[PDB]
Symmetry: C2
Subunit: 51 residues, 2 copies
């Protein structure tokens, strides 16, 4: 009766060589893969925009 096939869900590699299926959960548990020490930002806009 027109059988359906099932494909599994892929796994994405987080830090420490670990695997998960939801990026939010993997990021919250293990963390990103590479180390950039900081993000120096720049803001263009009105004073209210900076606030």
């Amino acid at each position: 009766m027109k059988e359906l096939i099932y494909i599994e869900e892929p796994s994405i590699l987080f830090a420490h060589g670990q695997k998960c299926t939801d990026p939010r959960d993997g990021l919250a548990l293990f963390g990103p893969l590479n180390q950039i020490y900081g993000i120096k930002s720049g803001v263009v806009g009105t004073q209210k925009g900076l606030q």
Copy 2:
């Protein structure tokens, strides 16, 4: 036999608003004025150059 005038040596500021005269000593005792979190390097050259 004329006359020579003495000019006081200038002072260069450092972190915490401290004053010194030698950049080496001032940097060692107090440190830089701004915070860049890190230096992400990049090397162009032969493998021996990288080593």
